[PDB]
Amino acid sequence: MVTIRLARHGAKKRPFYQVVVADSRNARNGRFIERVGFFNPIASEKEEGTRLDLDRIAHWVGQGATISDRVAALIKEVNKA
Amino acid sequence: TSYIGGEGHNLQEHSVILIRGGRVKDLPGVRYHTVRGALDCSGVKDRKQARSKYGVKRPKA
Amino acid sequence: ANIKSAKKRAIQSEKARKHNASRRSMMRTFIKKVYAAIEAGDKAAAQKAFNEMQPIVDRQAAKGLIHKNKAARHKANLTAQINKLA
Amino acid sequence: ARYLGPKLKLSRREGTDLFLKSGVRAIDTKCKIEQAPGQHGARKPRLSDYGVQLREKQKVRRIYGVLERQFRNYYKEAARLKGNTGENLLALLEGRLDNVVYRMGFGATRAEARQLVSHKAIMVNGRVVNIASYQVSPNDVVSIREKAKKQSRVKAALELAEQREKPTWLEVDAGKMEGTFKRKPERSDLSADINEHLIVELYSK
Amino acid sequence: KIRTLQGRVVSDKMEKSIVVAIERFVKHPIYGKFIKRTTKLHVHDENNECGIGDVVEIRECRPLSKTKSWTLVRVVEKA
RNA sequence: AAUUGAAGAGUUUGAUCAUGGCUCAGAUUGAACGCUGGCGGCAGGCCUAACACAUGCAAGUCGAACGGUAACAGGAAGAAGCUUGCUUCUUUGCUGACGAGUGGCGGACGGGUGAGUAAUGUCUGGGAAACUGCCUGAUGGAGGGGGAUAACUACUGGAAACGGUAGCUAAUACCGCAUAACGUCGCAAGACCAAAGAGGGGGACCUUCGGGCCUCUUGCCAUCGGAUGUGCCCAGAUGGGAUUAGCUAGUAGGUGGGGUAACGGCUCACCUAGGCGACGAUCCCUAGCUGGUCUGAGAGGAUGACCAGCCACACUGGAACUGAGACACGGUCCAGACUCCUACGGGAGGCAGCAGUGGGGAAUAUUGCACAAUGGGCGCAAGCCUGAUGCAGCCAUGCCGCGUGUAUGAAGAAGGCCUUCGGGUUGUAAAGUACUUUCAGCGGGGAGGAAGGGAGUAAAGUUAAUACCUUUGCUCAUUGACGUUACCCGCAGAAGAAGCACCGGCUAACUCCGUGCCAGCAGCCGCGGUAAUACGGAGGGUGCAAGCGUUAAUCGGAAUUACUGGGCGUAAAGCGCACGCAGGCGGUUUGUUAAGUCAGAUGUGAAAUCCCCGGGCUCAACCUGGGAACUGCAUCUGAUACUGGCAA
Ligand SMILES: [Mg+2]
Ligand SMILES: [Mg+2]
Ligand SMILES: [Mg+2]
Ligand SMILES: [Mg+2]
Ligand SMILES: [Mg+2]
Ligand SMILES: [Mg+2]
Ligand SMILES: [Mg+2]
Ligand SMILES: [Mg+2]
Ligand SMILES: [Mg+2]
Ligand SMILES: [Mg+2]
Ligand SMILES: [Mg+2]
Ligand SMILES: [Mg+2]
Ligand SMILES: [Mg+2]
Ligand SMILES: [Mg+2]
Ligand SMILES: [Mg+2]
Ligand SMILES: [Mg+2]
Ligand SMILES: [Mg+2]
Ligand SMILES: [Mg+2]
Ligand SMILES: [Mg+2]
Ligand SMILES: [Mg+2]
Ligand SMILES: [Mg+2]
Ligand SMILES: [Mg+2]
Ligand SMILES: [Mg+2]
Ligand SMILES: [Mg+2]
């Protein structure tokens, strides 16, 4: 199933996840289909520490993509705002 | 065939030495040196300049 | 094997191979009966054998022993044989 | 990582003062600046073009206390930046936090300013910075921490700085002990004896 | 309009088939000259009417034999 | 805004020009070696033997499919006590659960390696003759039976591995029968094809108290459509050799049959005699390919370690089976070479998974911690597994940052070296004075990575129904391996912290002494024969700096393979001369075409990396947001001067 999840990039101790829509079989940091945003967990304040492309995410959910747990929490928080 | 630099060596036959590139000009065909201070090719006795090129540990101050 | 799941899967694969070999042999036997009916020349016998066959291959395609494309291939080929036979 | 040798030898080699001492007294009574250091000092040196370029690079590096790898990174950055490479290099060198502290006068010399920076006695925009090579941007307020405002080093440094030229692109106080870094200094504003196209050509070699 | 090519028949010995040499005009990557390069495509030919040396117009289709994925559309001229 | 970038030197000669090689100056690396070695961050770490492997772990999960109870909890009775029931003890799968077993899904992913593979692979572009589990939308249906077989029991073969016989039992295991369609076949008539239940709660009515009965969640089965994945075809590009020129017999095509999910010589019979090759076929030698990396002004050249996409392989050689998907890393079968067990009959195994051992080698690390996070498998869920992954360990392997103190300080101190012996230099350097304490050491405090999940309630829907359940908020108590984390404050004291190469020219930096064409140096020119700035030591100096050199390798310089960008009278170089096919090029005007060409647009040209503008780690390395770029290719619409075609 095509899943929308977090591919961890960044460096040591400083994660930086990219919200990617990818086949659930590929590796975490491996082949994806589209990059729909990002999330910085240690995001300093004043900087946009989380950005999701809700129109594309909704497009994928309509196409049947499943949403990971952390991505679901991020969508909830961003649409709450 | 490998050149041996330094002031006097202690290499008898069957010695296990480590060699490196860099020919010697006046010698016919000698295309390698032996790294002093490597496996058996011990360092030159009583050097003070360029000790790292001849495998001599730093004399005490 | 040396993993419990591998051992269980090996047992299941052997059992399923035996079952599927039985069913596949039956299906091939019926198709061969039809083909012998054509190549012997008779027409009514050929059509009767085809009618006996068709439920078997369609049921096996439905159950997954083959593919519905394969069942359609056999069906179309044999039907064309019957209709050209006269 | 720091030239912890005698300082006036560098000035004697380059033939000119690099302000490596405080300036309480003229350096002539402290070293034979006219004579290059060592046994063969009175020797008259015929320098090549490579000699000219090498000595120029050394002079500016020694002034700011920069080593070769870091200075090469500065040159690469200056070349990368738009505009004149030589003036960009000089401006990047001036932006160093230790040099900014020196110019603002909290250090009698750049080594003194460097130790002040490295001992967490300096703040930038309020945050403590102990990086001797921190790049000070426009409008920053380089300050002195309260627990280090009482050091006689800073006082003596301020009264030694007051008798020199005041860097225009700066605004310094002796009471609050702050300094606004108004603009980036220009090649025109800096000392005109530094001939940086020699460095440019050297690194283009 | 559908993608297509136009070439010159070099052999019709094959039954229900022809071989078409298609020349392309490629600028050389290094020297910048415009060099002639010719590709030979085994072209399917129902009916079999084209002769050796005629300009025929061809279209890609599904595989038909081992080396025949192209087929005729029309004959531009007779030679 | 997405760039702004291009150095030469030595050496042929008595000397000079030129030609021409050779060598050096730079950048870099998966580096090794010598000397030396303080801290931290980020990254990298078997390039050789795809050599052999001791050892532990790397793939399980589901009791909400099923029979069941091996163990634990142990509730009732019964054990049967004075503890009047906190005595072992007997029964009950009774319950929570759960070893072993059936069954479903996973094991085809993640992880490793580059042996093979020179084009059956890869990159780019374009297609048609296609399957696609889990995911998703719609349409429907979910009736009724049947025979089993594990588990278990009994017997029993074998040293073991492994079985065997008889008997019993369940299912969402398996097979019919009913029911079909927009599904398959067929032109049509028509013929044919499936299914599986489980779980939670509940009125009232039934109640054999199983349970029915009612709603809810979820699963099952046709069929169509989406998305993802995969299979297949075409074109261009994708190394060297012509001292490898002919190769090919299912070979090329056609027809017909068979086969695949799908087109296809994929396979077979027959019939044609073709197919490919000088635009390099066949053969031979190396080789994984790409994004990219290194160098370069650029064009190019070299290389593809790390990271990511694709492929291939899993002890060697083969096969197929189950499966939506494999001809399958930790599955099966066979053969073979090793290694091990054996009762001698027979068996077992496969680190190129992590760590590790041996060996090879110049050289490459821990038999570590944790599932907290991200992701994956299973599961309704909690949760279980995860050597993926997050961290930590070792290593100066690389990049980046910081420290080893700051100033004042001439008695220009002593000592050392040189001396023209008058002095000069080491040298403000030290000593002395005052000051600071970064980092390391000690002590104290302390972010963030943590989202979710568990319990209960309020709402909300659902539905007779406040019941469950599904959302949504709400309070509660929690979840961190790293970790005595980053970081902040205090302590005491310069306190714990500089070396390497070079000094004749190239090339920055020079003199004494020892040696005497010896010892030796060396990258080239060369040096060394009694006054050595070239050897060795010393002083002084230069460059770089926790690094410094040597070696290996690539590009540069090298315009020294010259496309950008070279030459051929004598330096190397016009075939001895002609004819001439293919090939290259083509006078002049009008018309037409739009291939080349140009312009514009659209689609792609993965992400990262390079570059530009910003942001965040105290700065930088590093990580990021956005852009630009990816010089390309395919269409479409225009221009059509020049080239090309076509007709005059
Ligand atoms: Mg076995
Ligand atoms: Mg450094
Ligand atoms: Mg290897
Ligand atoms: Mg496997
Ligand atoms: Mg079933
Ligand atoms: Mg190979
Ligand atoms: Mg060039
Ligand atoms: Mg092996
Ligand atoms: Mg199958
Ligand atoms: Mg695998
Ligand atoms: Mg293994
Ligand atoms: Mg290993
Ligand atoms: Mg060894
Ligand atoms: Mg926390
Ligand atoms: Mg010199
Ligand atoms: Mg002498
Ligand atoms: Mg070149
Ligand atoms: Mg020439
Ligand atoms: Mg001659
Ligand atoms: Mg000649
Ligand atoms: Mg001639
Ligand atoms: Mg013309
Ligand atoms: Mg890109
Ligand atoms: Mg014309």
Curated annotation (Swiss-Prot), chain A:
Alphabetically ordered keywords of this record: Endonuclease, Hydrolase, Nuclease, Ribonucleoprotein, Ribosomal protein
GO cellular component: cytoplasm; cytosolic small ribosomal subunit; small ribosomal subunit
Molecular function in Gene Ontology: DNA endonuclease activity; four-way junction DNA binding; structural constituent of ribosome
Taxonomic superkingdom: Bacteria
Record carries keyword Ribonucleoprotein: yes
Keyword Hydrolase annotated: yes
Biological-process GO terms, alphabetical: cytoplasmic translation; ribosomal small subunit assembly
Chain ranges passing through the membrane: none
InterPro entries hit by this protein: Ribosomal_bS16 (IPR000307), Ribosomal_bS16_CS (IPR020592), Ribosomal_bS16_dom_sf (IPR023803)
Pfam families referenced in this protein's UniProt entry, alphabetically: Ribosomal_S16 (PF00886)
Induction (free text): Part of the rpsP-rimM-trmD-rplS operon.
Function: In addition to being a ribosomal protein, S16 also has a cation-dependent endonuclease activity.
Similarity remark: Belongs to the bacterial ribosomal protein bS16 family.
Oligomeric and partner information: Part of the 30S ribosomal subunit.
Name of the protein in question: Small ribosomal subunit protein bS16
UniProtKB/Swiss-Prot annotation, chain B:
Lineage: Bacteria, Pseudomonadati, Pseudomonadota, Gammaproteobacteria, Enterobacterales
Family note: Belongs to the universal ribosomal protein uS12 family.
Note: At least 19 substitutions or deletions in 11 codons can promote streptomycin resistance, dependence or pseudodependence; all but one of the streptomycin resistant mutations (K42R) are associated with hyperaccurate translation and thus reduced translational efficiency.
Modified residues (3-methylthioaspartic acid): 26
Record note on quaternary structure: Part of the 30S ribosomal subunit. Contacts proteins S8 and S17. Interacts with ArfA. May interact with IF1 in the 30S initiation complex.
Residues annotated as signal peptide: none
Residue span relative to the full protein: 64 to 124 of 124
Protein name: Small ribosomal subunit protein uS12
Purpose: With S4 and S5 plays an important role in translational accuracy.
Organism for this UniProt entry: Escherichia coli (strain K12)
Modified residues (N6-acetyllysine): 45
UniProtKB/Swiss-Prot annotation, chain C:
InterPro entries linked: Ribosomal_bS20 (IPR002583), Ribosomal_bS20_sf (IPR036510)
GO terms, biological process: cytoplasmic translation; ribosomal small subunit assembly
Positions of the UniProt region annotated as Disordered: 1-25
One cellular-component annotation, GO: cytosol
GO molecular-function terms, A-Z: ornithine decarboxylase inhibitor activity; small ribosomal subunit rRNA binding; structural constituent of ribosome
Domain of life: Bacteria
A UniProt-annotated Pfam family: Ribosomal_S20p
Entry keyword Signal: no
Keyword Ribosomal protein found: yes
Alphabetic keyword roster: Ribonucleoprotein, Ribosomal protein, RNA-binding, rRNA-binding
Family: Belongs to the bacterial ribosomal protein bS20 family.
Record note on quaternary structure: Part of the 30S ribosomal subunit.
NCBIfam families hit by this protein: S20
PANTHER family: 30S RIBOSOMAL PROTEIN S20 (PTHR33398), SMALL RIBOSOMAL SUBUNIT PROTEIN BS20C (PTHR33398:SF1)
Protein's job: Binds directly to 16S ribosomal RNA.
This protein's name: Small ribosomal subunit protein bS20
Organism: Escherichia coli (strain K12)
Lineage: Bacteria, Pseudomonadati, Pseudomonadota, Gammaproteobacteria, Enterobacterales
Swiss-Prot record, chain E:
CDD domains: Ribosomal_uS17 (cd00364)
Domain of life assignment: Bacteria
Residue ranges the record marks as coiled coil: none
GO biological process per UniProt: cytoplasmic translation; response to antibiotic; ribosomal small subunit assembly
Alphabetized GO MF terms: rRNA binding; small ribosomal subunit rRNA binding; structural constituent of ribosome; zinc ion binding
GO cellular component: cytoplasm; cytosolic small ribosomal subunit
One Pfam family named in its UniProt record: Ribosomal_S17
Record's subunit section: Part of the 30S ribosomal subunit.
Further comment: The strain missing both S17 and L29 grows very slowly and has a rather unstable temperature-sensitive phenotype.
Name of this protein: Small ribosomal subunit protein uS17
Gene: rpsQ
